[PDB]
């Protein structure tokens, strides 16, 4: 499913940061009951950059094994060096994932021939939807609409998740795509307004503790009733600021521990704990969209 | 050496994207005779996203075995994950490279707190010198002045390879740092002027290209001598831009497959090779500093 | 009016740099022929920076003496001393003006403190309708949310031209204002996006020379018509970029004398002459846009 | 005097906002007594956007017989429009004044052909020196060190004043020009490294209330003692930064009110009076300083 409120999952983790499997299955539930419409499995919130590969298919492996078949997973799968992307998209091929989501490259700077090069060479090594994904903030990179429209042309790569917060990009990238090509937000504070411009769903930070009502949110906003879903959008505001107070997934995760959906709120180096002010402040903006 | 002209040196490949040995003790050969202070090895210029860790080492070994003693190597050593960094330091612990270059973790955008435990934590596993490396643009993080004098502290953190260019950066930096502190451009075009600041030296991607001339300008810099070494920086101004007219290393391999020093400009993607017009735009600056 | 297409028109001048009485008049009908809401006249696109008050008074007059009641004329009375905006109102008062524009206080980078109180000075003295108008790119200061809410509670501040081009800046301000308070775009590129998020029109500088298909767009627009607005915004588009090519008002004016709007492109300085490269570069867009 | 230490003075008011003259007498016999070099009247500092041109006139002339030929006046004649840039310069045409300070036109965004345009027509409208003024944060343009080349070349443009705060122009603009064209910082938090780097002096902001502390700063780095200069800079670090911690010169009237020499500390709208966070604040800034 690549529409609607669909999960960018923390990765629980004991004290150890290890997996912990209880919490996943807790947060999974969660999702299900709670009409999610899919779950991205090690994104960027789900910690990518601090697992190595065999623990981050472990991970995509447990989400679909835990799912068994009520709600679709889609694996995170970027990297930064071309093989290393192809190689870790054929550990998933035939896994039961629904798709993938391909990050550009981070670091490297690659030019935007480089990146209609990288994302090529990926989807031509696997029958998975690739779903393209644009972050500049942490990147130092930015797929331009012209770019995703180029790419947009090869059969499996079949939507993006926008996350530069730059809602004219909307409707640059739409014209230059197929009506089936999927714009989703990344960017959860701008995704209300993201979909209203035609976008057709979000991969959510806020999901993780707000499911329900984002699940709402995304659905009043496919059906154009966007007056309705910004009421709920005004309630969630601050917590799609405030999981930012510090470097996300540190306020997510502990908003998590907080409601009881996971056991503990550690992360791994060079992620931190929460400052005490952070907990303030995220404890206020759960509040204010009624979650605790 | 953490002083003078330092080279960024590049990973020069074969065609298939491998390390090519011949190239490779070629360009260590040409560094020994030009005056290079020291060789920053699979540093950025160095290709460190694109090589997996065994080959990473293997570049660094290499490059140890062929500098002979006669220049010494430090080795990139850094990653976005902390036991990531960990790992690749020990690779290195007992092998004969003088210290290491390590980045702060890029992609997922730390805290100065966890840039803090991050550094620690990888000083802390061995005995050989850090210098830090802050690059903005390409990490999506900022190692500000006060956090580089909480590291400067740990005893075996002992330099800073500052790629801001941000000439402020200088004297801030300097004021919270022992005397013993070094300061490194990793900024060519405004190196000289990082120097005059009261920097150390270079860590260059412009000496790859230009060794003699930037050694010359480094001695003339570190005398006092700052209009005779801006003759040189004069002449070196459009290759210190042009290197970047795609993405590094994208024109300093072709630079250096022109000038003879390597066999092939081959990159590993997502780096692609040079258009046509960057070789134009390559070469003019080349000639511009009479090295062609 | 103060909703649907609104031109900030230009101020055509002889070659000695004076008003062109005969050019505005046949800018003027062409306006009310081609069903255009409004004419902001002595904004930025009618050069307010190098009109001296009484010249600047001069042409409000002229304008509203040729609209002879057949268009409502909004006077642009900003200024960045808060004496002299009240000054240049008072001007206004009774001339038969509908409304003002009044920009930020430019150069002088005021607190959000200090535009309250700018604003709400100038509100004060006069029983006209005042449209706030925000654009940092020129002004170096950014009226935010916040300070527009507080605003909309003073009787006549009644709307804002919203130039950042920010299109997150749409619903943040109308959460915070009554239903009544209109929100107008001041980016043409970004203008149909801007309408489709919540505004109520554009004050526009493509409206100069596409008045008829801008006034459609914006209705379509209002109607919830937005894939028929977006296939005219794409005709356009190359003009709402290109009319900036060189700064505005240069590229507007050569397009109006090209059309045989007005006699002569002059401008004064520090606006200069259309480059040729300019003119190519505007006539393209005019040709893609129908209109040459 | 276009070297060392030249100060941006405040234009003191009563309470009704016009000219203090006994106030203004007490800052120049201040400014006479510290070694300040020279003092630009009515720049930015100044106030020069809310007064009228003949309070203008009015405040520079009287500065100029307080002055009492004592020490050098520059009068700040900037204008966006040339015309009126030209007027104001005209009213200084043989009056005693040393030179004039012209910031590159706000607002209305001229290309750098316009700013050459500008500045060469004003330059030809009076004999007197002309220093060009960028800041771009407050004009929303940027004079270019290749326009400067360009416009150093006419006889009596003899300096810039560079407040971008970024040190790089420095070197881009010396090595276009002749070695009698003057660079002046006009930041103050760089303006030691700016002199570090072949810079000439600072207009400065906070000479306004430590000015012998900066004469004696610009006199060591004239004289190549940078680390002495440095201890100076470091005393008036937190000064250079809380100067600007509410608009200027909102922060500086009230540090001067504070040390007796102005006997109010009222502006003109829209600056507003100073808060009670920023007093604390500079005071805390002013006993760093230990000039409280
Ligand atoms: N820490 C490295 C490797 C992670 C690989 C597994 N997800 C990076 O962010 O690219
Ligand atoms: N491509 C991954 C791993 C590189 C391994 C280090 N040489 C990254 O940039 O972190
Ligand atoms: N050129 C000055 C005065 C213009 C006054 C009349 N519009 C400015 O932009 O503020
Ligand atoms: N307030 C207008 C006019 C100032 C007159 C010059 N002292 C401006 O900043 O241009
Ligand atoms: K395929
Ligand atoms: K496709
Ligand atoms: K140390
Ligand atoms: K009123
Ligand atoms: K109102
Ligand atoms: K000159």
Same mark, same amino acid.
Request: charged letters at 20%; a negative charge; aromatic letters at 6%.
């Given at each position: 499913?690549?529409? /609607? %409120?669909?999960?960018?999952?923390? +990765? ?6 290890n ?15 709670? /009409?999610? #419409?899919?779950?991205? #499995? =090690? ?29 679709? =997973?889609?694996?995170? +799968? ?8 192809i %190689? ?13 989501? &391909?990050? +550009? ?5 690659? %030019? ?14 696997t ?5 393209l994904?644009? =972050?500049?903030?942490? +990147? ?9 429209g ?12 926008? *996350? ?18 999927? $714009?989703? %937000?990344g960017?959860?504070? #701008?995704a ?6 035609? /976008?057709?769903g979000?991969i959510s930070?806020?999901?993780?503790? *707000? ?5 709402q949110?995304?659905?009043?906003? *496919?059906e /154009? ?10 309630? $969630?505001?601050? $917590? ?12 997510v ?8 959906? =996971? ?6 180096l060079?992620?931190?704990?929460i400052?005490? #002010?952070?907990?303030? &402040? ?6 204010h *969209?009624?979650?605790?």
């Open positions: 499913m690549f529409t /609607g %409120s669909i999960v960018a999952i923390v +990765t629980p983790m004991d004290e150890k940061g997996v912990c499997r209880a919490s996943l299955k807790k947060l999974i539930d969660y999702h299900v009951a709670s /009409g999610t #419409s899919a779950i991205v #499995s =090690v994104g960027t919130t789900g910690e990518f950059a601090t697992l190595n590969h065999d623990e981050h298919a472990d991970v995509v492996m447990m989400t679909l094994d835990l799912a068994d078949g009520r709600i679709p =997973v889609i694996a995170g +799968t970027g990297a930064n060096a071309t093989a290393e992307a %190689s870790l998209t054929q550990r998933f091929n035939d896994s039961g994932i629904v798709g993938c989501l &391909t990050v +550009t490259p981070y670091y490297n700077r690659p %030019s935007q021939e480089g990146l209609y090069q990288h994302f090529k060479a990926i989807a031509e090594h029958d998975l939807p690739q779903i994904y644009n =972050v500049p903030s942490r +990147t130092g990179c930015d797929l331009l609409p012209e770019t995703v180029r790419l947009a042309k090869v059969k499996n790569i079949i939507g993006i998740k926008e *996350a530069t917060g730059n809602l004219t990009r909307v409707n640059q990238i739409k014209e230059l795509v197929s009506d089936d090509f999927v $714009l989703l %937000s960017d959860d504070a #701008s209300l307004d993201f979909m209203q411009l035609g /976008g057709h979000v930070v806020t999901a993780n503790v *707000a499911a329900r009502d984002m699940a949110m995304c659905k009043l906003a *496919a /154009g009733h966007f007056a309705e879903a910004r009421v709920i959008n005004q309630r $969630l505001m601050p $917590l799609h600021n405030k999981l930012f107070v510090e470097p996300n997934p540190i306020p995760k502990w908003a998590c521990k907080e409601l009881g959906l =996971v056991a503990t709120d550690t992360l791994r060079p992620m931190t704990p400052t005490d #002010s952070g907990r303030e &402040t995220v404890r206020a903006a759960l509040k *969209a009624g979650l605790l």
